[PDB]
Design a binder for this molecule. Structure first.
Ligand code: ERM
Ligand code: CLR
Ligand code: OLB
Ligand code: OLB
Ligand code: OLB
Ligand code: OLC
Ligand code: OLA
Ligand code: OLA
Ligand code: PLM
Length: 375
């Protein structure tokens, strides 16, 4: 039997996988480099991810077409065979752990809204980036250390089940199933943190509005004195420079209205509280817009990161199946793995572009670069 010719697959993968990978990732790299409105610590996570995915498109994917266009034999020098396999595992592991790091960072941005400093966040982002790259080297390093065996002076550039079986098993657990478990946990932690944030907002909004109704109905000075002291210790619950002054206005306004209540002026205190209703609306509507934006961004990150992990699932499941199952047809599972490697390349390839397309400023940058603007 003869398989035939598979050049049509090679041409299809250049147009629909390699070109979009190199194209989409350079656009993300250009946006973070040229647009000053995007030069923030959180986007350096995206740039590193885009660099890793761009390096797959230029150095891993074109070398991966050779097995499709030619035979099983390696045409390039012997030294470049473990080097290509190493870069393949390195850059593909980096793209999975970057999303894991972006997810944990985004959860921290919700759980810890304050304590954010521009200079300190840059250092913190670079530290987390470095850790992700060191994690990726550690998972990819067993390939060149173990090496690939050759009488013939030519080798077949593929990891065998006899030599790399355990690497394929524990490498998959470390590169995919460990960041997947972390991302599942952070998903439910983010769902809990966003509900708690909303529940505390209503808790303070109700306490503010209910004590204000006591003042508008008050007849004596004692009714105002007690209802205003409750708002004094509850004003710091919604706030904690912008938050330090945010509470300071209302805390000062309550103290000024309590001064009138101490004096005995009931009408003057009631007037100060009704003029305070326009001040509480300005902070409630602002904090209500912040939670809606956090929830919208988390829903976007969720679907995009889930579709990424879903496209890597066929490769890592079949991988473990070929290793653990001995009764399974090895020929059919190898044929499926060849397709699943390419579905994974698509997944990492278009991953940063798809995500950044939901940010209007990033989407506006891409629209300028496709017509070669660069401002
Ligand atoms: C996409 N990339 C592909 C790359 C790879 O398989 N490259 C070869 C060259 O292609 C195969 O898939 C081919 C396709 C046809 C049959 N093949 C095999 O049988 C064996 C896999 C295998 C070996 C032993 C036992 C079971 C399966 N292949 C190979 O060695 C390694 C990866 C990887 C392995 C382990 C951890 C990882 N993290 C990230 C990654 C990764 C990135 C990830
Ligand atoms: C046949 C294969 C090997 C070559 C494929 C050519 C690739 C590298 C080409 C084809 C179209 C190209 C893109 C066309 C448009 C732009 C907009 C420009 O502002 C920045 C670069 C960018 C994003 C290009 C980068 C390189 C690109 C992806
Ligand atoms: C990072 C750079 C990767 C360098 C990794 C070193 C592996 C090596 O050269 O040893 C090979 C032996 O197994 C002999 O065949
Ligand atoms: C082979 C295909 C080549 C793709 C390259 C085409 C993209 C255009 C570009 O990067 O040039 C603009 C800058 O030079 C700024 O002036
Ligand atoms: C991979 C190949 C993609 C090439 C992309 C090259 C982009 C260079 C550019 O446009 O930047 C210049 C600006 O500073 C001009 O003001
Ligand atoms: C296989 C999925 C199993 C269970 C569903 C749980 C949902 C898992 C979806 C992961 C998406 C994730 O990464 O989200 C993180 C969160 O949004 C950070 O801000
Ligand atoms: C830094 C953290 C790096 C963590 C490294 C984790 C896993 C690497 C996988 C090791 C598998 C080696 C198996 C070799 C074998 O086949 O005997
Ligand atoms: C998707 C059906 C193609 C499978 C036909 C079998 C031929 C095997 C030869 C090369 C495998 C490359 C095909 C992988 C393309 C899928 C990637 C994608 O989703 O864009
Ligand atoms: C600036 O105005 C943007 C650049 C415009 C696009 C240039 C087109 C380059 C063509 C190269 C594609 C080669 C691969 C073909 C597919 C098989």
């Amino acid at each position: 039997e003869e398989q035939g010719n598979k050049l049509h697959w090679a041409a299809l993968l250049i147009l629909m996988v390699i070109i979009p990978t190199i194209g989409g990732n350079t656009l993300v790299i250009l946006a973070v480099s040229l647009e000053k409105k995007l030069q923030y610590a959180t986007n350096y996570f995206l740039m590193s991810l885009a660099v890793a995915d761009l390096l797959v498109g230029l150095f891993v994917m074109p070398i991966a077409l050779l097995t499709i266009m030619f035979e099983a034999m390696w045409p390039l020098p012997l030294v470049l065979c473990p080097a290509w396999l190493f870069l393949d595992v390195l850059f593909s592991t980096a793209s999975i752990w970057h999303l894991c790091a972006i997810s944990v960072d985004r959860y921290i941005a919700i759980k810890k809204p304050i304590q954010a400093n521009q200079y300190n966040s840059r250092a913190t982002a670079f530290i987390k980036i470095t850790v992700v790259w060191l994690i990726s080297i550690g998972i990819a390093i067993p390939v060149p250390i173990k090496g690939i065996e050759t009488n013939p002076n030519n080798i077949t550039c593929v990891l065998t089940k006899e030599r790399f079986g355990d690497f394929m098993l524990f490498g998959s657990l470390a590169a995919f199933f460990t960041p997947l478990a972390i991302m599942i946990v952070t998903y439910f932690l983010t769902i809990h943190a966003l509900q708690k944030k909303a529940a505390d907002l209503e808790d303070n909004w109700e306490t503010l509005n209910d004590n204000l109704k006591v003042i508008e109905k008050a007849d004596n000075a004692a009714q105002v004195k007690d209802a205003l002291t409750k708002m004094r210790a509850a004003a710091l619950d919604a706030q904690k420079k912008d938050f330090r002054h945010g509470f300071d206005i209302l805390v000062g306004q309550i103290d000024d209205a309590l001064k009138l209540a101490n004096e005995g002026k009931v009408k003057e205190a009631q007037a100060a509280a009704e003029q305070l209703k326009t001040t509480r609306n300005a902070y409630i509507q602002k904090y209500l817009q912040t939670i809606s934006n956090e929830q919208r961004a988390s829903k976007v990150l969720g679907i995009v990161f889930f579709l990424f992990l879903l496209m890597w699932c066929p490769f890592f499941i079949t991988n473990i199946t070929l290793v653990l199952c001995d009764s399974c047809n090895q020929t059919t599972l190898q044929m499926l793995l060849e397709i699943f490697v390419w579905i994974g390349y698509v997944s990492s390839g278009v991953n940063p572009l798809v995500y950044t397309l939901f940010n209007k400023t990033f989407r506006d940058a891409f629209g300028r670069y496709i017509t070669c603007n660069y401002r």
